[PDB]
Symmetry: none
Subunit: 72 residues, 6 copies
């Protein structure tokens, strides 16, 4: 004889604001042979799961902003 | 004889704001042979799970901002 | 005979704000042979699980900001 | 003046046999509320990325093999 | 004047056999509230990244093999 | 004047057999509230990154093998 029993019985102006956010990312990269041969320049690779937030400014997440030149 | 029993019985201006955030990232990178041969330049690689937040400024997460030149 | 029994019975201006944050990151990098041969330049690699927050300033997480030159 | 240069110049009976194998699986399960209320039975749930290989035997990966009864 | 330069110049019966193997698995499970209320039975949950290999035997990875009964 | 330079110039019966193996597993489980209320039974949960290999035997990785009964 086996017997079992269970018996159970306000302005919020910017309030909850989730932004510039990255969450829940599962990334497998098995074999990526990255051979980056750069001469005289700018290179950006492999930016994953990145966040930024600015106020009163100029923001670039991954910018290949190559050259400035000025002669006078 | 086996017997078992269980018996159970306000302005919030910026209040809860999650931003410039990265959470919950599972990343396997098995074999990435990174051979970065740079000559005379800027290179950025491999930026993962990164966060920034600025106020009154200019912010770049991963920027390949190569060169400035000025002659007078 | 086996018997068992269990018997159970306010302005908040910036209040709780989580930002420029990184949490909960599980990262396996098995074999990444990083051979970084740099000559005359700037290189950045391998920035993982990084955070920054500025106020009244200019902030770059991983910036390859290569060169400045000025002649007069 | 900026100058840069780069200069580059036997039976095998069971030999390499990959079997009963699982590789390269990226799985996000955000919110699965698993409420498994079992009474008097067998239940199996949530078998992911599993492998088995037998020789001279009887193998079940995830088998809900409920009951045997014998009276004499 | 900036100058840079780089200058570069046998039976194998069971030989290499990868089996009953699991590799390279990135798994995020954010919120799975597992409430397993079992009474008088067998339950199995949450088997991830598991391996087995047998020889001359009977093998079950995750088997809900409920009951045996014999009366005489 | 900036100058830089770089100058570079047999039976194998069971030989290399990787089996019953688990490698390279990145697993984030943020919030899994596991409430396992068992009465009179067998329960198994949460088996991750597990390996076994037998020879001349009967092996179960995670088996909910509930009950045996024999009366005479």
């Amino acid at each position: 004889g086996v017997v079992a029993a269970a018996e159970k019985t306000v302005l919020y102006v910017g309030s909850k604001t989730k932004e510039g956010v990255v969450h829940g990312v599962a990334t497998v990269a098995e074999k990526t042979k990255e051979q980056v041969t750069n001469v005289g320049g700018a290179v950006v690779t492999g930016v994953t799961a990145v966040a930024q937030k600015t106020v009163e400014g100029a923001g670039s997440i991954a910018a290949a902003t190559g050259f400035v030149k000025k002669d006078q």
